[PDB]
Amino acid sequence: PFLELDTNLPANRVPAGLEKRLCAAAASILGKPADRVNVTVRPGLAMALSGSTEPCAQLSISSIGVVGTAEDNRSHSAHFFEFLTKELALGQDRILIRFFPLESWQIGKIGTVMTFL
Amino acid sequence: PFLELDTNLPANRVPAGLEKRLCAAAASILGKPADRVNVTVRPGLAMALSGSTEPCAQLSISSIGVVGTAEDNRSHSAHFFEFLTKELALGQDRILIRFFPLESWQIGKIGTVMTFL
Amino acid sequence: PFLELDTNLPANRVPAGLEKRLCAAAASILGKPADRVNVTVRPGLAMALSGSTEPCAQLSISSIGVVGTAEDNRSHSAHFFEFLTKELALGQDRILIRFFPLESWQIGKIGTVMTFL
Ligand SMILES: *c1cc(-c2ccccc2)ncn1
Ligand SMILES: *c1cc(-c2ccccc2)ncn1
Ligand SMILES: *c1cc(-c2ccccc2)ncn1
Ligand SMILES: [Cl-]
Ligand SMILES: [Cl-]
Ligand SMILES: [Cl-]
C-alpha cells in the first residue's frame, strides 16, 4: 500500500523513525507485508484541518483490495488513529484519513505494471 | 472538503494566513461549513505548469457530493481562480485545478468513517 | 498530464532542470504536447519504499485518455523507469508509479473546466 502523511508539524516535531514504524503498523492493520508498504511523510506544511491551523495531519491510504468498504475502513481508521495520535501527540480531532482503492493496472513497478506480475 | 495547493512560490511569497482565507473561500464556493474545510499548502516545490517553471500553483479539491459535474465544477473553478490569482499574484495561465469526488466510506474521522456518522 | 514526484532525495541531489526534462519525456511517452505537461517535484521528504528508507521516488501520472489500460501503462512504466532511474541515479527497486485516469470535467483551467474548452 501507499501511505502519504501531510503535516504542519515541523520535521523536528515528527518523531525519528516514524516512516518505518508506520510501515510496520500498516502491515498489521491492512494485512500486507511490511516489506511492501510505502510511506511518504511531508512535514512543515501550512495546513488548516477543520478550519484550524493548530498542529494536524492528513493521511491518505491507497491499496489493492482492502480499502474499498465502509466496514473494513472503519476498522482501519480506528487502528491508524491509535497509531498516529500517539506518535504525533495529536488529538483525534486533528487527524483525517482518506482511503483510495487501487487496481493492479494502476501500479507501475519494475518497468511494467502489477497486472503482469 | 480537502483542498491541497502545491506551488513553486517559496513560502515567503505565499501570503500569511492563506490557508485560513482559503477555508473561508471554499466554504462559500462549495456550500460547506468553513469549520469543516481542510487546506494543505506545499510551497517551495520544483514545478513546471504547461511546460514552464515560472511561478505557478496546482489546486486539488476533493469533496462529497458537490464536485462531480462539469456544470458545478465550471462555477467552482471560476471562483477559485478569482481567489487564487489575486492571493498568489498569479495569472490565470499559471493555475490548474483538479476535482475529485469522494464518498463517505473513504473518509476516516475520529477513528471510524463518515458512513457511520 | 499531471506528473507528481515525491522523493527523499534532498533538493541538492535532484538534478537541476529535472522538471523541464520530465515534461519533454512525458510528452514523448504519453503522446501529449510538451507545453501541456505539468510536473511537480517534492524533494527532501521522509520516505520508505517497500519498507526501506534508502533513496527512492514515487511518481503519480494523471491524464485524460492514455493511462487507463494495463497494456498502455506497461509501456509508459518502462519508459518512465528508464528516464527516472538514470536522472535520479536510483535502482529500479527504488521507484514506483501510480496511474490515474482523469475526465475533462475534473480539470479546472482558465476559470472553467476542460469539458467546455
Ligand atoms: C502496497 C503493497 C504492495 C504489494 C505488492 C506486492 C505484493 C504485496 C503487496 N504494493 C504497493 N503498495
Ligand atoms: C470537507 C468537509 C467535510 C464535512 C464533514 C462533515 C460535515 C460537513 C462537511 N469533511 C471533509 N472535507
Ligand atoms: C496534461 C495535458 C493537458 C492538455 C490540455 C489540452 C490539450 C492537450 C493536453 N492538460 C492537463 N494535463
Ligand atoms: Cl496494496
Ligand atoms: Cl466534503
Ligand atoms: Cl492529459
CA A40, A27, B111 angle in degrees (round to 5)? Answer: 80
Is the distance from CB of A66 to CB of A5 less than 8 angstroms? no
Cell of A10: 515541523
In the block, cell 462559500 appears at B28
Is the distance from CB of A43 to CB of A33 less than 8 angstroms? no
Residues in C touching A104 (Cβ below 8 Å): 70
CA separation for the pair C117, C110 (Å, rounded): 10
User: For strand C57-64 and strand C95-102, is the pairing parallel, antiparallel, or unpaired?
Assistant: parallel
B55 is catalytic: no
Mutation choice for ligand 1 from A60, A64, A105, CB with most ligand atoms inside 8 A = A64
- Sign of the dihedral defined by the CA atoms of residues A38, A20, A6, B30, in that order: positive
Cell of A77: 481508521
The closest alpha carbon to B103, from B73, B67, B75, B77, belongs to B67
Cell of C71: 497494456
The closest alpha carbon to C57, from C112, C108, C104, C3, belongs to C3
The closest alpha carbon to C22, from C40, C10, C6, belongs to C40
Q: How many residues does chain C have?
A: 117
Element (H, E) at B75: helix B70-88
Q: What is the A109 CA–ligand 5 centroid distance (Å)? A: 33
CA separation for the pair B94, B21 (Å, rounded): 20
Residues in C touching B69 (Cβ below 8 Å): 105
Cell of C87: 536522472
Q: Judge: C74–A115 Cβ closer than 8 Å, yes or no.
A: yes
Q: What is the CATH number of the domain that holds B112?
A: 3.30.429.10
Ligand 1: residues whose CB is within 6 Å?
A 1-2, 32-33, 36-38, 63, 107
What Å distances lie between residue B46 and A51, A117, B11, C91, C93, CA to CA?
A: 28, 33, 13, 22, 24
Burial of A53 (0-12, 13-18, 19+ CB in 10 A): middle
CA separation for the pair C61, C49 (Å, rounded): 18
Cell of A58: 492528513
Point out which residues pair with B52 in neighbouring strands: B49
Per the structure, the count of domains in chain B is 1
Expressed as residue numbers, the domain containing C66 is 1-117
CA separation for the pair C91, C93 (Å, rounded): 5
Burial of C113 (0-12, 13-18, 19+ CB in 10 A): buried
CA separation for the pair A21, A34 (Å, rounded): 10
CB contact set of B86 (below 8 Å; sequence gap of 6+): none
Rg (CA), chain C: 15
CA separation for the pair A84, A25 (Å, rounded): 10
Q: Resolution, in Å, please?
A: 1.1
Cell of C111: 476559470
Is the distance from CB of C46 to CB of C8 less than 8 angstroms? yes
Point out which residues pair with A49 in neighbouring strands: A52
H helical segments located in C16-66: 18-30
CA C24, A41, A29 angle in degrees (round to 5)? Answer: 120
CA C63 to the chain's CA centroid: 10
Amino acid, single-letter form, for residue B92: Q
Method: X-ray
Query: Phi then psi for C23, rounded to 5 degrees?
Result: -60, -50
CA separation for the pair B96, C28 (Å, rounded): 22
Element (H, E) at B112: strand B112-113
Cα distance from N-terminal residue to C-terminal residue, chain C = 16
- Sign of the dihedral defined by the CA atoms of residues C60, A36, A14, B106, in that order: positive
Buried b (16+ CB within 10 A) or exposed e, A8-38: bbeeeebeeebbbebbebbbebbebeeeebb
Is the distance from CB of C67 to CB of C26 less than 8 angstroms? no
